Symmetry: D2
Subunit: 145 residues, 4 copies
Protein backbone atom coordinates (compact mmCIF):
# COMPACT_ATOMS: atom_id res chain seq x y z
CA UNK A 1 0.00 0.00 0.00
CA UNK A 2 0.97 3.69 -0.47
CA UNK A 3 0.51 6.62 1.97
CA UNK A 4 -0.20 9.85 0.06
CA UNK A 5 1.06 13.01 1.77
CA UNK A 6 -0.02 16.39 0.41
CA UNK A 7 1.72 19.69 1.19
CA UNK A 8 -1.23 20.81 3.35
CA UNK A 9 -1.12 17.67 5.51
CA UNK A 10 2.68 17.76 5.82
CA UNK A 11 2.43 21.36 7.04
CA UNK A 12 -0.28 20.38 9.55
CA UNK A 13 2.06 17.71 10.96
CA UNK A 14 5.01 20.13 11.00
CA UNK A 15 3.05 22.63 13.11
CA UNK A 16 2.10 19.87 15.55
CA UNK A 17 5.77 18.97 16.01
CA UNK A 18 6.73 22.65 16.29
CA UNK A 19 4.45 23.08 19.31
CA UNK A 20 6.29 20.30 21.18
CA UNK A 21 9.63 22.04 20.55
CA UNK A 22 8.46 25.13 22.45
CA UNK A 23 9.91 27.31 23.83
CA UNK A 24 12.00 28.16 20.75
CA UNK A 25 14.56 29.98 22.92
CA UNK A 26 16.16 26.68 24.00
CA UNK A 27 17.33 26.02 20.43
CA UNK A 28 20.46 27.48 18.82
CA UNK A 29 19.53 26.27 15.35
CA UNK A 30 18.23 23.57 13.00
CA UNK A 31 20.18 20.98 11.01
CA UNK A 32 18.17 19.53 8.13
CA UNK A 33 19.04 16.13 6.68
CA UNK A 34 19.21 16.54 2.90
CA UNK A 35 17.03 16.10 1.12
CA UNK A 36 14.08 14.73 3.09
CA UNK A 37 14.49 17.05 6.06
CA UNK A 38 14.81 20.23 4.00
CA UNK A 39 11.11 21.10 3.70
CA UNK A 40 10.21 19.96 7.23
CA UNK A 41 13.20 21.91 8.51
CA UNK A 42 12.07 25.04 6.69
CA UNK A 43 8.60 24.81 8.25
CA UNK A 44 9.96 24.42 11.79
CA UNK A 45 12.34 27.34 11.22
CA UNK A 46 9.36 29.49 10.23
CA UNK A 47 7.22 28.35 13.16
CA UNK A 48 9.98 28.54 15.77
CA UNK A 49 11.51 31.67 14.29
CA UNK A 50 14.88 30.05 13.96
CA UNK A 51 17.09 31.57 11.28
CA UNK A 52 20.20 29.44 11.82
CA UNK A 53 19.38 26.58 9.46
CA UNK A 54 22.17 24.24 8.36
CA UNK A 55 22.31 20.90 6.52
CA UNK A 56 23.99 17.49 6.51
CA UNK A 57 24.31 15.67 3.18
CA UNK A 58 24.83 11.91 2.98
CA UNK A 59 25.03 9.49 0.02
CA UNK A 60 25.25 5.66 -0.31
CA UNK A 61 27.99 3.49 -1.91
CA UNK A 62 27.95 -6.69 -0.50
CA UNK A 63 27.60 -3.75 1.91
CA UNK A 64 26.13 -0.26 1.81
CA UNK A 65 28.43 2.62 2.73
CA UNK A 66 27.39 6.02 3.99
CA UNK A 67 29.25 8.97 2.51
CA UNK A 68 29.10 12.41 4.12
CA UNK A 69 29.13 14.86 1.21
CA UNK A 70 28.58 17.94 3.37
CA UNK A 71 28.66 18.21 7.18
CA UNK A 72 27.33 20.75 9.69
CA UNK A 73 29.81 21.71 12.43
CA UNK A 74 29.51 20.66 16.06
CA UNK A 75 28.07 17.79 18.08
CA UNK A 76 24.51 19.11 17.83
CA UNK A 77 24.27 20.67 21.30
CA UNK A 78 21.23 22.95 21.31
CA UNK A 79 20.37 21.90 17.77
CA UNK A 80 17.40 20.10 16.26
CA UNK A 81 18.23 17.49 13.64
CA UNK A 82 15.29 16.83 11.36
CA UNK A 83 14.51 14.32 8.65
CA UNK A 84 11.16 13.62 6.95
CA UNK A 85 10.93 10.06 8.25
CA UNK A 86 12.65 7.06 9.84
CA UNK A 87 12.04 3.67 8.21
CA UNK A 88 14.74 1.29 9.45
CA UNK A 89 16.99 3.88 11.04
CA UNK A 90 19.99 3.06 8.88
CA UNK A 91 20.63 6.74 8.17
CA UNK A 92 19.44 7.71 11.66
CA UNK A 93 22.36 5.83 13.25
CA UNK A 94 24.91 7.87 11.30
CA UNK A 95 23.27 11.16 12.31
CA UNK A 96 23.16 10.16 15.99
CA UNK A 97 26.86 9.35 15.73
CA UNK A 98 27.73 12.79 14.33
CA UNK A 99 25.33 14.79 16.51
CA UNK A 100 24.96 12.94 19.87
CA UNK A 101 23.80 16.03 21.80
CA UNK A 102 21.19 16.93 19.17
CA UNK A 103 17.42 16.54 19.49
CA UNK A 104 16.66 14.24 16.54
CA UNK A 105 13.07 14.39 15.24
CA UNK A 106 11.05 13.36 12.16
CA UNK A 107 7.50 13.78 10.85
CA UNK A 108 6.81 10.12 10.11
CA UNK A 109 8.11 7.00 11.82
CA UNK A 110 7.82 3.29 11.07
CA UNK A 111 8.14 0.62 13.84
CA UNK A 112 11.79 -0.32 13.16
CA UNK A 113 13.25 3.19 13.26
CA UNK A 114 10.88 4.53 15.92
CA UNK A 115 13.26 3.95 18.88
CA UNK A 116 15.97 6.03 17.18
CA UNK A 117 14.08 9.35 17.20
CA UNK A 118 13.45 11.68 20.15
CA UNK A 119 10.06 12.67 18.73
CA UNK A 120 7.82 12.19 15.69
CA UNK A 121 4.22 12.92 14.70
CA UNK A 122 2.69 10.10 12.63
CA UNK A 123 3.05 6.32 12.98
CA UNK A 124 3.28 4.46 9.67
CA UNK A 125 3.25 0.68 9.08
CA UNK A 126 6.59 -0.91 8.14
CA UNK A 127 5.24 -2.15 4.79
CA UNK A 128 3.67 1.15 3.72
CA UNK A 129 5.44 3.45 1.26
CA UNK A 130 5.09 7.13 2.17
CA UNK A 131 4.69 9.26 -0.96
CA UNK A 132 5.99 12.76 -0.17
CA UNK A 133 4.68 16.05 -1.71
CA UNK A 134 7.93 16.88 -3.51
CA UNK A 135 7.67 13.65 -5.52
CA UNK A 136 4.15 14.43 -6.73
CA UNK A 137 2.25 17.09 -8.65
CA UNK A 138 -1.19 18.12 -9.85
CA UNK A 139 -1.75 16.53 -13.27
CA UNK A 140 -4.64 15.27 -15.40
CA UNK A 141 -6.16 11.96 -14.30
CA UNK A 142 -8.47 10.06 -16.73
CA UNK A 143 -12.04 9.40 -15.55
CA UNK A 144 -12.71 5.93 -14.08
CA UNK A 145 -15.36 5.78 -16.87
Amino acid sequence: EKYIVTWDMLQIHARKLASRLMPSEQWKGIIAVSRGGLVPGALLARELGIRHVDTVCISSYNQRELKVLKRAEGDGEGFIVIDDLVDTGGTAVAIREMYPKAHFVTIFAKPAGRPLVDDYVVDIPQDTWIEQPWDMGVVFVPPIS
Copy 2:
Protein backbone atom coordinates in the same frame (compact mmCIF):
# COMPACT_ATOMS: atom_id res chain seq x y z
CA UNK B 1 -11.10 17.00 18.41
CA UNK B 2 -11.00 17.94 14.72
CA UNK B 3 -10.61 16.09 11.46
CA UNK B 4 -9.29 18.38 8.66
CA UNK B 5 -10.37 17.42 5.13
CA UNK B 6 -8.58 19.14 2.24
CA UNK B 7 -9.83 19.18 -1.35
CA UNK B 8 -7.13 16.72 -2.44
CA UNK B 9 -8.10 14.13 0.18
CA UNK B 10 -11.83 14.52 -0.49
CA UNK B 11 -11.18 13.85 -4.18
CA UNK B 12 -9.12 10.76 -3.36
CA UNK B 13 -11.99 9.38 -1.24
CA UNK B 14 -14.54 10.27 -3.93
CA UNK B 15 -12.54 8.36 -6.54
CA UNK B 16 -12.31 5.33 -4.21
CA UNK B 17 -16.08 5.33 -3.93
CA UNK B 18 -16.55 5.80 -7.68
CA UNK B 19 -14.55 2.64 -8.41
CA UNK B 20 -17.07 0.64 -6.34
CA UNK B 21 -20.03 2.19 -8.17
CA UNK B 22 -18.87 0.65 -11.47
CA UNK B 23 -20.20 0.05 -14.01
CA UNK B 24 -21.86 3.48 -14.63
CA UNK B 25 -24.46 2.00 -17.01
CA UNK B 26 -26.51 0.71 -14.09
CA UNK B 27 -27.13 4.26 -12.87
CA UNK B 28 -29.84 6.46 -14.30
CA UNK B 29 -28.35 9.48 -12.54
CA UNK B 30 -27.25 11.08 -9.28
CA UNK B 31 -29.20 12.79 -6.52
CA UNK B 32 -26.98 15.12 -4.49
CA UNK B 33 -28.14 16.10 -1.01
CA UNK B 34 -27.69 19.89 -0.91
CA UNK B 35 -25.43 21.34 0.09
CA UNK B 36 -22.97 18.83 1.57
CA UNK B 37 -23.37 16.21 -1.19
CA UNK B 38 -22.98 18.70 -4.06
CA UNK B 39 -19.19 18.53 -4.38
CA UNK B 40 -18.92 14.76 -3.80
CA UNK B 41 -21.83 14.30 -6.20
CA UNK B 42 -20.11 16.43 -8.84
CA UNK B 43 -16.96 14.34 -8.42
CA UNK B 44 -18.85 11.05 -8.85
CA UNK B 45 -20.57 12.47 -11.93
CA UNK B 46 -17.19 13.27 -13.51
CA UNK B 47 -15.66 9.87 -12.74
CA UNK B 48 -18.72 7.82 -13.72
CA UNK B 49 -19.55 10.11 -16.62
CA UNK B 50 -23.06 10.78 -15.42
CA UNK B 51 -24.52 13.98 -16.87
CA UNK B 52 -27.89 13.63 -15.11
CA UNK B 53 -27.33 15.20 -11.69
CA UNK B 54 -30.29 16.28 -9.56
CA UNK B 55 -30.69 17.58 -6.00
CA UNK B 56 -32.73 17.30 -2.83
CA UNK B 57 -32.67 20.36 -0.58
CA UNK B 58 -33.58 19.85 3.07
CA UNK B 59 -32.97 22.47 5.76
CA UNK B 60 -32.90 21.60 9.47
CA UNK B 61 -32.88 23.84 12.53
CA UNK B 62 -32.42 22.34 16.00
CA UNK B 63 -34.79 23.53 18.73
CA UNK B 64 -33.33 22.31 22.04
CA UNK B 65 -33.79 18.53 21.76
CA UNK B 66 -35.83 18.32 18.54
CA UNK B 67 -35.24 19.11 14.87
CA UNK B 68 -37.30 21.14 12.48
CA UNK B 69 -36.86 19.55 9.01
CA UNK B 70 -38.05 21.19 5.82
CA UNK B 71 -37.89 19.97 2.26
CA UNK B 72 -37.18 23.12 0.23
CA UNK B 73 -36.81 21.21 -3.03
CA UNK B 74 -37.32 17.53 -3.84
CA UNK B 75 -36.24 15.37 -6.77
CA UNK B 76 -39.10 13.34 -8.27
CA UNK B 77 -39.03 9.55 -8.01
CA UNK B 78 -38.35 6.72 -5.57
CA UNK B 79 -34.62 6.68 -6.31
CA UNK B 80 -34.83 3.60 -8.54
CA UNK B 81 -31.54 3.36 -10.41
CA UNK B 82 -30.19 6.49 -8.73
CA UNK B 83 -27.26 7.21 -6.44
CA UNK B 84 -28.09 9.40 -3.45
CA UNK B 85 -24.94 11.05 -2.20
CA UNK B 86 -24.22 13.16 0.85
CA UNK B 87 -20.87 14.28 2.29
CA UNK B 88 -21.26 12.54 5.63
CA UNK B 89 -23.61 10.98 8.15
CA UNK B 90 -23.33 12.02 11.81
CA UNK B 91 -26.31 11.06 13.97
CA UNK B 92 -28.17 9.66 10.98
CA UNK B 93 -31.08 12.08 11.25
CA UNK B 94 -30.77 13.23 7.64
CA UNK B 95 -30.06 9.71 6.35
CA UNK B 96 -33.27 8.30 7.86
CA UNK B 97 -35.33 11.03 6.18
CA UNK B 98 -33.61 10.49 2.82
CA UNK B 99 -34.09 6.69 2.78
CA UNK B 100 -37.78 7.52 3.24
CA UNK B 101 -38.08 9.85 0.29
CA UNK B 102 -35.85 7.75 -1.96
CA UNK B 103 -36.31 4.12 -0.72
CA UNK B 104 -35.10 2.30 -3.84
CA UNK B 105 -31.92 4.38 -4.06
CA UNK B 106 -28.30 3.47 -3.41
CA UNK B 107 -27.49 5.80 -0.52
CA UNK B 108 -23.79 6.53 -0.05
CA UNK B 109 -21.56 9.06 1.74
CA UNK B 110 -17.84 9.83 1.96
CA UNK B 111 -17.57 9.86 5.76
CA UNK B 112 -19.62 7.91 8.27
CA UNK B 113 -19.71 8.05 12.06
CA UNK B 114 -20.78 5.00 14.19
CA UNK B 115 -24.40 6.15 14.62
CA UNK B 116 -25.19 6.74 10.95
CA UNK B 117 -22.98 3.90 9.70
CA UNK B 118 -25.80 1.32 9.60
CA UNK B 119 -28.02 3.66 7.56
CA UNK B 120 -25.74 4.05 4.52
CA UNK B 121 -25.30 1.44 1.79
CA UNK B 122 -21.63 2.34 1.34
CA UNK B 123 -19.05 4.87 2.54
CA UNK B 124 -15.29 5.45 2.41
CA UNK B 125 -13.90 6.73 5.75
CA UNK B 126 -14.72 5.82 9.36
CA UNK B 127 -14.84 8.79 11.76
CA UNK B 128 -15.45 8.77 15.57
CA UNK B 129 -18.62 10.31 17.05
CA UNK B 130 -16.62 12.82 19.12
CA UNK B 131 -14.64 13.91 16.04
CA UNK B 132 -15.80 16.98 14.09
CA UNK B 133 -15.21 16.84 10.32
CA UNK B 134 -13.96 20.11 8.84
CA UNK B 135 -14.97 20.20 5.16
CA UNK B 136 -12.94 22.02 2.46
CA UNK B 137 -15.74 24.33 1.43
CA UNK B 138 -15.82 25.79 4.96
CA UNK B 139 -12.07 26.43 4.97
CA UNK B 140 -9.56 28.56 3.09
CA UNK B 141 -5.86 29.22 2.67
CA UNK B 142 -5.10 32.27 4.81
CA UNK B 143 -2.24 33.73 6.86
CA UNK B 144 -1.48 31.79 10.04
CA UNK B 145 0.77 33.42 12.71
CA UNK B 146 3.97 31.57 13.76
CA UNK B 147 3.91 29.35 16.85
CA UNK B 148 6.52 31.71 18.30
CA UNK B 149 7.11 35.42 17.77
CA UNK B 150 10.89 34.90 17.75
Copy 3:
Protein backbone atom coordinates in the same frame (compact mmCIF):
# COMPACT_ATOMS: atom_id res chain seq x y z
CA UNK C 1 -1.11 26.36 -23.57
CA UNK C 2 -3.03 24.89 -20.62
CA UNK C 3 -4.24 27.04 -17.71
CA UNK C 4 -3.97 24.96 -14.52
CA UNK C 5 -6.68 25.61 -11.91
CA UNK C 6 -6.26 24.06 -8.45
CA UNK C 7 -9.04 23.62 -5.88
CA UNK C 8 -7.62 26.40 -3.68
CA UNK C 9 -7.52 28.88 -6.56
CA UNK C 10 -10.98 27.95 -7.83
CA UNK C 11 -12.30 28.57 -4.31
CA UNK C 12 -10.62 31.99 -4.14
CA UNK C 13 -12.25 33.08 -7.41
CA UNK C 14 -15.59 31.73 -6.19
CA UNK C 15 -15.36 33.80 -3.01
CA UNK C 16 -14.53 36.95 -4.99
CA UNK C 17 -17.63 36.32 -7.12
CA UNK C 18 -19.77 35.64 -4.03
CA UNK C 19 -18.95 39.05 -2.55
CA UNK C 20 -20.35 40.70 -5.69
CA UNK C 21 -23.66 38.83 -5.42
CA UNK C 22 -24.37 40.46 -2.08
CA UNK C 23 -26.54 40.92 -0.33
CA UNK C 24 -27.80 37.29 -0.47
CA UNK C 25 -31.48 38.20 0.44
CA UNK C 26 -32.18 39.23 -3.16
CA UNK C 27 -31.72 35.61 -4.25
CA UNK C 28 -34.40 32.91 -4.10
CA UNK C 29 -31.95 30.19 -5.09
CA UNK C 30 -29.09 28.96 -7.29
CA UNK C 31 -29.32 26.90 -10.47
CA UNK C 32 -26.09 25.03 -11.21
CA UNK C 33 -25.31 24.00 -14.79
CA UNK C 34 -24.27 20.34 -14.79
CA UNK C 35 -21.55 19.48 -14.53
CA UNK C 36 -19.21 22.48 -14.69
CA UNK C 37 -21.27 24.74 -12.46
CA UNK C 38 -21.85 22.14 -9.73
CA UNK C 39 -18.72 22.88 -7.66
CA UNK C 40 -18.82 26.67 -8.16
CA UNK C 41 -22.54 26.63 -7.39
CA UNK C 42 -21.89 24.65 -4.20
CA UNK C 43 -19.33 27.23 -3.10
CA UNK C 44 -21.69 30.15 -3.78
CA UNK C 45 -24.46 28.39 -1.84
CA UNK C 46 -22.12 28.09 1.15
CA UNK C 47 -20.80 31.64 1.03
CA UNK C 48 -24.23 33.17 0.45
CA UNK C 49 -26.09 30.89 2.84
CA UNK C 50 -28.47 29.73 0.05
CA UNK C 51 -29.97 26.28 0.68
CA UNK C 52 -32.14 26.13 -2.41
CA UNK C 53 -29.81 24.78 -5.09
CA UNK C 54 -31.21 23.21 -8.26
CA UNK C 55 -29.63 21.96 -11.51
CA UNK C 56 -30.07 22.08 -15.31
CA UNK C 57 -28.62 19.26 -17.39
CA UNK C 58 -27.96 20.02 -21.05
CA UNK C 59 -26.57 17.49 -23.54
CA UNK C 60 -25.24 17.34 -27.10
CA UNK C 61 -26.16 15.04 -30.00
CA UNK C 62 -24.67 20.84 -32.61
CA UNK C 63 -28.04 19.77 -31.21
CA UNK C 64 -28.66 20.64 -27.56
CA UNK C 65 -31.10 18.65 -25.46
CA UNK C 66 -32.20 19.25 -21.93
CA UNK C 67 -32.05 16.08 -19.83
CA UNK C 68 -33.39 17.88 -16.76
CA UNK C 69 -34.41 21.50 -16.12
CA UNK C 70 -35.34 23.61 -13.10
CA UNK C 71 -38.88 25.01 -13.33
CA UNK C 72 -39.42 28.75 -13.73
CA UNK C 73 -37.96 31.64 -15.73
CA UNK C 74 -35.08 32.15 -13.30
CA UNK C 75 -36.56 35.20 -11.57
CA UNK C 76 -34.41 35.80 -8.50
CA UNK C 77 -32.16 32.83 -9.30
CA UNK C 78 -28.43 32.68 -10.00
CA UNK C 79 -27.51 30.46 -12.94
CA UNK C 80 -23.86 29.45 -12.76
CA UNK C 81 -21.43 27.53 -14.94
CA UNK C 82 -17.65 27.12 -14.49
CA UNK C 83 -16.83 29.02 -17.68
CA UNK C 84 -18.03 30.47 -20.98
CA UNK C 85 -15.94 29.76 -24.08
CA UNK C 86 -18.03 30.57 -27.16
CA UNK C 87 -21.41 31.00 -25.51
CA UNK C 88 -23.01 28.04 -27.25
CA UNK C 89 -24.43 26.55 -24.06
CA UNK C 90 -24.84 30.05 -22.59
CA UNK C 91 -27.27 31.09 -25.34
CA UNK C 92 -29.41 28.05 -24.53
CA UNK C 93 -29.40 28.93 -20.82
CA UNK C 94 -30.48 32.52 -21.56
CA UNK C 95 -33.54 31.26 -23.45
CA UNK C 96 -34.59 28.96 -20.58
CA UNK C 97 -33.79 31.38 -17.75
CA UNK C 98 -34.25 34.98 -19.09
CA UNK C 99 -34.78 36.88 -15.82
CA UNK C 100 -31.94 34.89 -14.26
CA UNK C 101 -28.56 36.37 -13.32
CA UNK C 102 -26.09 34.27 -15.33
CA UNK C 103 -22.52 34.10 -13.97
CA UNK C 104 -19.32 32.06 -14.48
CA UNK C 105 -15.83 31.88 -12.95
CA UNK C 106 -13.78 32.08 -16.15
CA UNK C 107 -14.62 33.83 -19.41
CA UNK C 108 -13.06 33.82 -22.85
CA UNK C 109 -13.41 36.78 -25.28
CA UNK C 110 -16.04 35.16 -27.50
CA UNK C 111 -18.38 34.24 -24.66
CA UNK C 112 -17.60 37.17 -22.39
CA UNK C 113 -20.56 39.33 -23.59
CA UNK C 114 -23.01 36.47 -23.01
CA UNK C 115 -22.59 36.59 -19.20
CA UNK C 116 -23.77 39.05 -16.54
CA UNK C 117 -20.60 38.62 -14.48
CA UNK C 118 -17.37 36.61 -14.22
CA UNK C 119 -14.03 36.74 -12.40
CA UNK C 120 -11.06 35.66 -14.53
CA UNK C 121 -10.21 36.50 -18.15
CA UNK C 122 -8.77 33.63 -20.20
CA UNK C 123 -7.47 33.77 -23.80
CA UNK C 124 -9.58 32.15 -26.54
CA UNK C 125 -6.90 29.57 -27.42
CA UNK C 126 -6.17 28.61 -23.81
CA UNK C 127 -7.47 25.35 -22.37
CA UNK C 128 -8.70 25.63 -18.77
CA UNK C 129 -7.77 22.51 -16.80
CA UNK C 130 -10.31 22.21 -13.97
CA UNK C 131 -9.52 20.67 -10.50
CA UNK C 132 -12.06 17.85 -10.91
CA UNK C 133 -10.15 16.53 -13.93
CA UNK C 134 -6.83 16.39 -12.06
CA UNK C 135 -5.25 14.69 -9.07
CA UNK C 136 -2.04 14.54 -7.04
CA UNK C 137 0.05 11.70 -8.45
CA UNK C 138 3.74 10.79 -8.69
CA UNK C 139 5.69 12.86 -11.22
CA UNK C 140 9.21 11.64 -12.16
CA UNK C 141 12.18 14.03 -11.68
CA UNK C 142 13.00 16.21 -14.64
CA UNK C 143 16.40 14.39 -14.57
CA UNK C 144 17.36 10.73 -13.92
CA UNK C 145 20.62 11.87 -12.33
Copy 4:
Protein backbone atom coordinates in the same frame (compact mmCIF):
# COMPACT_ATOMS: atom_id res chain seq x y z
CA UNK D 1 -2.76 44.27 -3.05
CA UNK D 2 -1.60 40.69 -2.17
CA UNK D 3 -0.56 37.69 -4.32
CA UNK D 4 -1.54 34.30 -2.84
CA UNK D 5 0.92 31.47 -3.54
CA UNK D 6 -0.24 27.93 -2.74
CA UNK D 7 2.11 24.95 -2.39
CA UNK D 8 0.95 23.47 -5.72
CA UNK D 9 1.64 26.68 -7.65
CA UNK D 10 5.07 27.19 -6.06
CA UNK D 11 5.98 23.67 -7.16
CA UNK D 12 4.81 24.32 -10.73
CA UNK D 13 7.05 27.40 -10.88
CA UNK D 14 9.97 25.51 -9.34
CA UNK D 15 9.65 22.77 -11.96
CA UNK D 16 9.68 25.36 -14.77
CA UNK D 17 12.87 26.83 -13.30
CA UNK D 18 14.49 23.40 -13.01
CA UNK D 19 13.92 22.77 -16.73
CA UNK D 20 16.12 25.76 -17.62
CA UNK D 21 18.86 24.62 -15.27
CA UNK D 22 19.21 21.38 -17.25
CA UNK D 23 21.48 19.53 -17.63
CA UNK D 24 22.18 19.00 -13.94
CA UNK D 25 25.70 17.69 -14.54
CA UNK D 26 26.95 21.27 -14.85
CA UNK D 27 26.07 21.93 -11.20
CA UNK D 28 28.23 21.02 -8.21
CA UNK D 29 25.44 21.80 -5.74
CA UNK D 30 22.79 24.18 -4.44
CA UNK D 31 23.10 26.96 -1.84
CA UNK D 32 19.74 27.99 -0.42
CA UNK D 33 19.18 31.38 1.20
CA UNK D 34 17.55 30.71 4.57
CA UNK D 35 14.72 30.74 5.09
CA UNK D 36 12.92 31.75 1.90
CA UNK D 37 15.09 29.75 -0.49
CA UNK D 38 14.88 26.53 1.55
CA UNK D 39 11.70 25.06 0.03
CA UNK D 40 12.49 26.21 -3.53
CA UNK D 41 15.99 24.83 -3.11
CA UNK D 42 14.63 21.48 -1.92
CA UNK D 43 12.37 21.26 -4.98
CA UNK D 44 15.26 21.96 -7.37
CA UNK D 45 17.43 19.41 -5.55
CA UNK D 46 14.73 16.78 -6.11
CA UNK D 47 14.16 17.72 -9.76
CA UNK D 48 17.83 18.02 -10.65
CA UNK D 49 18.92 15.03 -8.58
CA UNK D 50 21.31 17.24 -6.60
CA UNK D 51 22.27 16.00 -3.13
CA UNK D 52 24.80 18.63 -2.10
CA UNK D 53 22.47 21.25 -0.64
CA UNK D 54 23.94 23.96 1.57
CA UNK D 55 22.73 27.21 3.14
CA UNK D 56 23.59 30.84 3.75
CA UNK D 57 21.86 32.44 6.74
CA UNK D 58 21.53 36.23 6.68
CA UNK D 59 19.64 38.12 9.38
CA UNK D 60 18.18 41.53 8.50
CA UNK D 61 17.07 44.33 10.84
CA UNK D 62 15.40 47.55 9.69
CA UNK D 63 16.37 50.60 11.76
CA UNK D 64 14.24 53.36 10.21
CA UNK D 65 15.82 54.01 6.80
CA UNK D 66 18.92 51.83 7.15
CA UNK D 67 19.37 48.05 7.19
CA UNK D 68 21.73 46.06 9.43
CA UNK D 69 22.96 42.80 7.91
CA UNK D 70 24.44 39.95 9.96
CA UNK D 71 25.62 36.64 8.52
CA UNK D 72 24.82 33.83 10.96
CA UNK D 73 26.28 31.13 8.74
CA UNK D 74 27.57 30.87 5.17
CA UNK D 75 28.58 28.23 2.64
CA UNK D 76 32.28 27.98 1.74
CA UNK D 77 33.69 29.30 -1.53
CA UNK D 78 32.65 31.80 -4.19
CA UNK D 79 29.75 29.75 -5.53
CA UNK D 80 31.66 28.47 -8.57
CA UNK D 81 29.46 25.84 -10.21
CA UNK D 82 26.76 26.31 -7.57
CA UNK D 83 23.18 27.48 -7.73
CA UNK D 84 22.19 30.12 -5.20
CA UNK D 85 18.42 30.26 -4.79
CA UNK D 86 16.00 32.48 -2.91
CA UNK D 87 12.20 32.67 -3.07
CA UNK D 88 11.96 36.28 -4.25
CA UNK D 89 13.67 39.63 -4.79
CA UNK D 90 11.87 42.74 -3.53
CA UNK D 91 14.17 45.75 -3.28
CA UNK D 92 17.20 43.64 -4.15
CA UNK D 93 18.96 44.35 -0.87
CA UNK D 94 19.65 40.72 -0.02
CA UNK D 95 20.50 39.88 -3.64
CA UNK D 96 23.33 42.44 -3.77
CA UNK D 97 24.76 41.09 -0.51
CA UNK D 98 24.59 37.49 -1.72
CA UNK D 99 26.11 38.31 -5.11
CA UNK D 100 29.06 39.82 -3.30
CA UNK D 101 29.55 36.65 -1.24
CA UNK D 102 29.12 34.33 -4.23
CA UNK D 103 30.15 36.23 -7.41
CA UNK D 104 30.68 33.05 -9.48
CA UNK D 105 27.30 31.58 -8.54
CA UNK D 106 24.18 31.36 -10.69
CA UNK D 107 21.67 33.41 -8.67
CA UNK D 108 18.02 32.55 -9.22
CA UNK D 109 14.62 33.15 -7.60
CA UNK D 110 11.01 32.14 -8.23
CA UNK D 111 9.46 35.61 -8.03
CA UNK D 112 10.97 38.95 -9.03
CA UNK D 113 9.73 42.49 -8.50
CA UNK D 114 10.90 45.26 -10.92
CA UNK D 115 13.45 46.72 -8.47
CA UNK D 116 15.40 43.51 -7.88
CA UNK D 117 14.77 41.98 -11.31
CA UNK D 118 18.13 43.09 -12.79
CA UNK D 119 20.04 41.41 -9.95
CA UNK D 120 18.98 37.82 -10.68
CA UNK D 121 20.44 35.55 -13.35
CA UNK D 122 17.04 33.93 -13.86
CA UNK D 123 13.53 33.97 -12.38
CA UNK D 124 10.06 32.62 -13.20
CA UNK D 125 7.29 35.03 -12.20
CA UNK D 126 7.00 38.80 -12.61
CA UNK D 127 5.46 40.51 -9.58
CA UNK D 128 4.52 44.21 -9.24
CA UNK D 129 6.37 46.36 -6.70
CA UNK D 130 3.19 47.25 -4.77
CA UNK D 131 2.09 43.60 -4.48
CA UNK D 132 2.85 41.60 -1.33
CA UNK D 133 3.71 37.95 -2.02
CA UNK D 134 2.03 35.58 0.44
CA UNK D 135 4.17 32.43 0.59
CA UNK D 136 2.71 28.99 1.49
CA UNK D 137 4.83 28.42 4.57
CA UNK D 138 3.22 31.51 6.14
CA UNK D 139 -0.31 30.27 5.48
CA UNK D 140 -2.54 27.36 6.40
CA UNK D 141 -5.91 25.77 5.71
CA UNK D 142 -8.24 26.95 8.47
CA UNK D 143 -11.95 27.68 8.96
CA UNK D 144 -13.17 30.76 7.09
CA UNK D 145 -16.57 32.28 8.03
CA UNK D 146 -19.19 32.59 5.25
CA UNK D 147 -19.36 35.93 3.43
CA UNK D 148 -22.99 36.19 4.62
CA UNK D 149 -24.97 34.93 7.62
CA UNK D 150 -28.24 34.06 5.84
